[PDB]
Write an enzyme that holds these catalytic residues in place. Structure first.
Site, PDB file in Angstrom:
ATOM      1  N   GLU A   1      33.297  21.320 -27.985  1.00  0.00           N
ATOM      2  CA  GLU A   1      32.063  20.630 -27.590  1.00  0.00           C
ATOM      3  C   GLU A   1      32.268  19.782 -26.334  1.00  0.00           C
ATOM      4  OE1 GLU A   1      28.916  20.603 -29.204  1.00  0.00           O
ATOM      5  OE2 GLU A   1      29.531  22.183 -30.580  1.00  0.00           O
ATOM      6  N   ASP A   2      32.656  20.461 -25.255  1.00  0.00           N
ATOM      7  CA  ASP A   2      32.595  20.045 -23.855  1.00  0.00           C
ATOM      8  C   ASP A   2      33.539  18.915 -23.477  1.00  0.00           C
ATOM      9  OD1 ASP A   2      29.012  20.030 -24.307  1.00  0.00           O
ATOM     10  OD2 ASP A   2      30.379  21.737 -24.191  1.00  0.00           O
ATOM     11  N   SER A   3      34.324  18.382 -24.401  1.00  0.00           N
ATOM     12  CA  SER A   3      35.167  17.259 -24.040  1.00  0.00           C
ATOM     13  C   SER A   3      36.372  17.734 -23.234  1.00  0.00           C
ATOM     14  CB  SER A   3      35.626  16.520 -25.281  1.00  0.00           C
ATOM     15  OG  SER A   3      36.392  15.403 -24.906  1.00  0.00           O
TER      16      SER A   3
END
Ligand SMILES: [Zn+2]
Ligand SMILES: [Zn+2]
Ligand SMILES: [Zn+2]
Lengths: 65, 46, 266, 33, 131
Positions: free
Chosen positions: E3-5
């Protein structure tokens, strides 16, 4: 600013190269891919530091004692 | 290191105490910046 | 010989390049990891400023001071300031530097590496020389100032390795690549039509032969014939860093044996 | 004749001090160029 | 990187990556009533009461502009009587800490002895930060 000591990925010092590269550009005005090939940063992820870095120190030091 | 209050134009290491003059001398501006530290405070290079 | 043979190709003062053949995969990987991280080095840690009116910050300037690499030939006889039983620093666990740079020349007063003077008694040790690798003999561009500005320091330099920080890493971008002509099927290249034409004919393809296309698939072979390109800053030369790295790896495996002797007797 | 009002002026305009300005004016008067 | 981290080389953060100073400034006022009564900036004591340590004060309740500040230091010494000496100093910021940087001792159009403090504070890109 100043060119950073130890260009972050590799950490080879390049802050020595700035005045010589400055006079290399002002004195000879080549393509900077060849100029940095003369000052020898073979990997592009460290070539980015001298190709990028902006000095603001002179516009700082114009001001005042 | 005798330096207490230094204005901009007159970089003047003169003095200051409570309510002496809000204007500095030799130039009529009145900003009155205060001088730096006598003692030494130590920092880490991290 | 018996095991790891070394066949050094082109080298320099600050470049090594070598076929390191008949060695194990994780042996090569562990070696490049310990030579990245695990070598002690002198550099400036504690910074006490007296006065400053320059355009740069005290903390910023101290961060550059820390990033200055000094001479670290004689790392073995310098103590940690934690294991030294003195009062917080002495002349066997710490290196004092003192620098006062004043300007009066009215056109871009400069400050570089070679201004550092080792006022601490070095006890005749090859330590603390600011590494002028410069062609024109100046050093790193430290600071710029004018008449009223001033640069006053009192610094203490200490030991340590590349795992505390990045300031105690003399390692500088150590490479590792084996087996270009991939007979090991460790990697299939991304391709539209042909990987041999699309993907470029790589660099170290000269030494190991082209993989003789018409053969069935080999499964037995492990990782061999590694070509590890190393480098340095210049705090130690490029042989001595491989020396101290293999030495510290050997010392830590000896620490495993130390713990085993701790175990089997008690 | 009789003074009334102190109208706040937009700078770099025709009552600004720094409409009279070049690099020496900006730097000696502490203005960002 | 679920999730994009994004994932960070800490060594370049030691080398300077996204390193940053930060500049907040303060205010303090020797206030002005209607009956021409002036207030004072001086080193306060017990003679609304705090219990902050006076350890980094100046002659006139100030702080010298080149010293590391921490904890709950009293920022600007201020006193005012009515015809007593109150605890009109302001203690430190509970949310930030750093270095006092720049002090000017000025006034207004009508003569309020006005002193100020800017704070410098280094800040390193830590894990819970948004890029
Ligand atoms: Zn780099
Ligand atoms: Zn002045
Ligand atoms: Zn000691």
């Amino acid at each position: 600013m100043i060119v950073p000591v130890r260009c972050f990925s590799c950490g080879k010092v390049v802050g020595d190269k700035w005045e010589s590269y400055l006079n290399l550009l002002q004195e000879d005005e080549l393509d900077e891919g060849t100029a940095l090939s003369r000052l020898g940063l073979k990997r592009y992820c460290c070539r980015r530091m001298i190709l990028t870095h902006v000095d603001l120190i002179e516009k700082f030091l114009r001001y005042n004692p | 290191a005798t330096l207490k209050y230094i204005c901009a134009e007159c970089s003047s290491k003169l003095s200051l105490s409570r309510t002496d003059a809000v204007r500095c001398k030799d130039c009529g501006h009145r900003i009155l910046l205060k001088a730096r530290t006598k003692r030494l405070v130590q920092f880490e290079a991290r | 010989e018996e095991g790891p043979q070394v066949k050094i190709r082109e080298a320099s003062k600050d470049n090594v390049d070598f076929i390191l053949s008949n060695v194990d995969l994780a042996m090569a990987n562990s070696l490049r990891r310990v030579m990245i991280a695990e070598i002690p080095t002198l550099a400036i840690d504690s910074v006490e400023v007296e006065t400053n009116t320059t355009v740069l910050a005290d903390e910023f300037i101290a961060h550059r001071l820390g990033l200055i690499p000094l001479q670290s030939m004689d790392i073995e006889q310098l103590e940690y300031s934690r294991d030294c039983f003195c009062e917080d620093h002495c002349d066997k666990c710490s290196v004092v530097l003192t620098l006062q740079a004043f300007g009066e020349s009215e056109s871009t007063t400069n400050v570089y590496s070679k201004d550092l003077v080792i006022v601490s008694n070095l006890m005749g040790r090859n330590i603390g020389h600011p590494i002028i690798q410069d062609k024109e003999g100046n050093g790193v561009l430290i600071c710029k100032l004018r008449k009223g500005q001033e640069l006053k320091l009192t610094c203490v330099a200490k030991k340590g390795i590349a795992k505390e920080h990045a300031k105690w890493g003399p390692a500088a971008a150590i490479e590792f690549e084996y087996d270009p002509w991939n007979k090991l099927k460790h990697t299939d290249y991304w391709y539209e039509q042909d990987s041999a034409k699309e993907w470029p004919q790589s660099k170290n393809c000269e030494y190991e032969d082209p993989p003789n296309e018409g053969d069935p698939f080999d499964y037995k072979a492990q990782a061999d014939t590694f070509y590890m390109n190393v480098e340095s800053v210049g705090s130690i030369p490029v042989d001595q860093v491989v020396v101290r790295g293999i030495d510290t790896l050997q010392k830590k495996v000896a620490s495993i044996l130390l713990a085993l002797t701790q175990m089997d007797q008690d | 004749k009789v003074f009334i009002g102190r109208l706040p002026i937009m700078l770099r305009s025709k009552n600004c001090y720094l409409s009279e300005a070049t690099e020496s004016d900006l730097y000696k008067l502490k203005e960002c160029p | 990187n679920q999730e994009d981290s994004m994932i960070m080389n800490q060594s370049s953060i030691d080398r300077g990556l996204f390193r940053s100073l930060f500049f907040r400034s303060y205010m303090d006022q020797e206030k002005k009533y209607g009956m021409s009564i002036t207030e004072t900036f001086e080193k306060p004591q017990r003679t609304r009461m705090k219990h902050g340590t006076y350890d980094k004060l100046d002659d006139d309740g100030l702080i010298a502009p080149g010293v590391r500040v921490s904890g709950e230091d009293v920022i600007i010494g201020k006193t005012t009587p009515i015809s007593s000496k109150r605890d009109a100093s302001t203690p430190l910021r509970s949310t930030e800490n750093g270095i006092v940087d720049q002090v000017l001792v000025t006034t207004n159009q009508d003569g309020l002895k006005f002193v100020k403090v800017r704070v410098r504070t280094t800040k390193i890109p830590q894990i819970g930060d948004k890029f």
